[PDB]
Every structure is written in C-alpha cells, then in structure tokens.
Amino acid sequence: EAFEISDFKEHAKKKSMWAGALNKVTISGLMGVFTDLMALPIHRDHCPALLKIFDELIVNATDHERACHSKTKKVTYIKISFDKGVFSCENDGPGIPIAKHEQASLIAKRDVYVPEVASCFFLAGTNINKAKDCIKGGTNGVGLKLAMVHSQWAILTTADGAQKYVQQINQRLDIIEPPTITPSREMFTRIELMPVYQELGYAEPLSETEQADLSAWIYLRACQCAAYVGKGTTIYYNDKPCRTGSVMALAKMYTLLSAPNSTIHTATIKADAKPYSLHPLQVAAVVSPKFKKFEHVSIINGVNCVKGEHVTFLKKTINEMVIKKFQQTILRDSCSNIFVVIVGSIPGIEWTGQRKDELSIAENVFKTHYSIPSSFLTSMTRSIVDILLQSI
C-alpha cells in the first residue's frame, strides 16, 4: 500500500525489534524465584517486551554501580519494587545532572534539562560514544525511552545533592510534563512506572497468576543482579535484601529442587593482559545424572545472556578433558549433565540485537586471553566420567 514514515514512539509501540514481542509468547527457559530460595520454571506465556522494560531499568542501575565503584560517592543500593502493578527502581550515587541540555533545547524549541534527554530522547545517553573496553551493558540510548513508551504513567526523580528534579512522563511518552525543581540534600535516581499491561496481553489489573509470575521473575532478576554487582552494593526487592551475592548461591538456587545437596565446582577464569585481566569471570557448576541437557545462566556486563562463545569455550574445554579421561577408562554427551552459572564482565563485546540475548565475540578472545583452572576441569571431568561409566 502506501509508503508510511514512522516516528520512534509509534514504531516502538508496534515493532518487536526494540524489546521483543509486544504480546504474550512462549519464552524458552523462563524462570522465577519462589520461596529457601528456589528458581523454578514459569510454564505460562508472557510478554518479552514487558520483562525487557523491567530489565532496562535494572541494567541502568547496575551500569551506574559499575561506573561509580571507584569514585568518591559509590552506588550502595539498588531498590526494586513491584506492587499493585507499579514497578520502581531506585539507586543512590550521583544523580543525573540537573542542568539545561543546550542541544536538546534547540531541537525541542524549549527548555530541556538533561534528565528529560535521558528519559524522552531516543538514541541519547552517556554510552552513545562507548569506549572499546567499557563493560556497562548500556549502549543504545533507548532503554529508558522504551520503558516510558510502554508506561501509562511514569515518574523520573533524581537529586544531585543540591537540587531534586521530578518529572512526569505519561501516556506512552505522548505527554512530557514540565519538571519540578526544588532544593534538596538527597542524591539518588528513581524511576517509577505503570506498564500498559492490557495492551501487552495481561489483565487489568494483573490476575493472581500473572502477578505471582511477574513478581517471581523480577525477584530472580534482582538475585542475578546481586551476584554481579560489586562488594559494596546491596540489592533489594520489595525492601528485602537479595542475599545471593555469589555464583555459588545462584547455582544452589537453580538446582535446589532437582539436585539438592549437590557438589558445586567453582572456578575464577582469569586473563593475564588488560583489559581482560581487570575482569575475572566467576563460575559455579553442578553435575547431575538428573539433568537432561546442558544449561547455563550467564550474567555478563549486568545482562542475562542466553547465548555466547564464552559458554562454548567452557564446554569445548571440558569436552577435551572428558574424551581423554573417558578413553583411558574404557560434546553433547560430555556436557549434557552440566548446569553452570557464569557471572562477570567481558570488555569489547557486541550483541545480536537491542534485547542483548546473544553476545557477539571472536572465539579467539578466550583462546588467546583466558585460562580455565585445571583443578576445576579435573574435578568436573571426574564427575562427568562417572556418570558416563554408569550408563555403560
């Protein structure tokens, strides 16, 4: 028919490329935390874009944590809330600067302050020009805008130690209210919003099962955050601390139902050269005959990554050992009883899309730079070969 020209807002309300499907679909490997913390599958369809806007706020807070972990004022908390359908994320550390943005003001022909650029201008942020070694997850300058475009109402609040800035952003970014600016001694950034649940396939208000599923998924996402952030940061979900600060605790949570009292093989995968040497990768793995296929949970640069060559590196290395030790005794066969958690930062990665589901890298990065400790390989191989010798 006709050739139409869209704007960002209308395009994002219609197109799955930005955040995933805009209706409920079957999400492979969808999990949530249920309370002992136990991660369990959610066998109901859910809207990927809805889960992504929660993710975009959580990764923004994790990014600020990494950015500040060496400065005077660090991020000491990330507080995530979900109640009556309202989602919020708050972190301390330096606020978004409360200042006029000259370029944005000229574009919009009115006064625009920096926090309005951060929340309302597509393709805008502090990572548009991104260093080659940056390990923040943010890159595109769209994540916070997508959260606004999928919100019936939203409130951005930020304080910089001298002033507080409050701005309402309503009706899927159609209405940007002028901000309120007052003196303040607080220092934080808070986003609070109500998603357009009904447009994304949910009930108005959330049904009992929808509410329980979403709360479980957010709780697990906060727990994944807690394993990734630095030592001086606490993550809260509905004011309870998420006490899963290690890959070991995450591995336990995922295997508590299926392999209780399991042995957890641990490793720190290290590199000798900067920038890789700044960024150890923490690994915890469980080997059980009860597991039916290889599975991993990877939190890389604060993002839940479902595919990447970092996984392949580990699998290929274990497989090599398993084949040798199996042959002396007598890839799918060698790894199908493994569950592994990998958490850490990797400099210089790219992605396959806005959702950051798959990281993109040369496999030689791991061959050249990283080393998997022999004690971990030996102990994993012993456990895997025993399972294999049973079947025989």
Ligand X SMILES: Nc1ncnc2c1ncn2[C@@H]1O[C@H](COP(=O)(O)OP(=O)(O)O)[C@@H](O)[C@H]1O
Rounded Cα–Cα distance for residues 359 and 327 (Å) = 34
Annotated binding site for ATP: 60, 91, 138-145
Pick what 126 binds: ligand X, Mg ion, none; C-beta below 5 to 8 Å, kind-dependent: ligand X
Of 66, 145, 252, 356, the one binding ligand X (CB under 6 A) is 145
Of 118, 135, 149, 341, the one binding ligand X (CB under 6 A) is 118
Rounded Cα–Cα distance for residues 322 and 238 (Å) = 44
Contacts of 210 (CB under 8 A, 6+ apart): 197, 202, 203
Of 20, 32, 48, 138, the one binding ligand X (CB under 6 A) is 138
Output the DSSP codes for 151-205.
Answer: EEEEEEEEEESSEEEEEEEETTTTEEPPPEEEE---EEEEEEEEE-TTTTT--SS
Rounded Cα–Cα distance for residues 222 and 68 (Å) = 19
Among the listed ranges 143-151, 263-271, 296-304, 350-358, the one in contact with ligand X (CB under 6 A) is 143-151
Among the listed ranges 140-148, 239-247, 297-305, 315-323, the one in contact with ligand X (CB under 6 A) is 140-148
Rounded Cα–Cα distance for residues 376 and 340 (Å) = 12
Residue 80 Cβ, how far from Mg ion at the closest point, in Å?
Answer: 15
Residue 146 Cβ, how far from ligand X at the closest point, in Å?
Answer: 8
Of 81, 88, 105, 126, the one binding ligand X (CB under 6 A) is 126
Determine if residue 345 is left, alpha or beta; phi over 0 gives left, psi from -120 to 50 gives alpha, anything else beta: beta
Query: Within 10 A of 256 (CB to CB), how many other CB atoms are there?
Result: 16
Smaller CB distance to Mg ion: residue 56 or 210? 56
Does residue 337 touch ligand X according to CB under 6 A? no
Total interface residues for ligand X by CB under 6 A: 19
Residue 303 backbone dihedrals phi, psi, to 5 degrees = -105, 140
Q: Is the dihedral of CA 152, 157, 158, 164 positive or negative?
A: positive
- By CB under 5 A, name the binding residues for Mg ion: 60, 138, 143
Residue 91 Cβ, how far from ligand X at the closest point, in Å?
Answer: 5
Pick what 61 binds: ligand X, Mg ion, none; C-beta below 5 to 8 Å, kind-dependent: ligand X
Rounded Cα–Cα distance for residues 285 and 267 (Å) = 9
Rounded Cα–Cα distance for residues 300 and 135 (Å) = 9
Residue 120 Cβ, how far from ligand X at the closest point, in Å?
Answer: 10
Does residue 64 touch ligand X according to CB under 6 A? yes
Does residue 319 touch ligand X according to CB under 6 A? no
Instruction: Answer whether 371's CB lies under 8 Å from 283's CB.
Output: no
Residue 75 Cβ, how far from Mg ion at the closest point, in Å?
Answer: 15
Smaller CB distance to ligand X: residue 118 or 342? 118
Rounded Cα–Cα distance for residues 66 and 62 (Å) = 6
Smaller CB distance to Mg ion: residue 143 or 344? 143
Does residue 61 touch ligand X according to CB under 6 A? yes
Residue 174 Cβ, how far from Mg ion at the closest point, in Å?
Answer: 22
Q: Which residues bind ligand X (CB under 6 A)?
A: 56, 60-61, 64, 91, 96, 118, 125-127, 138-145, 189
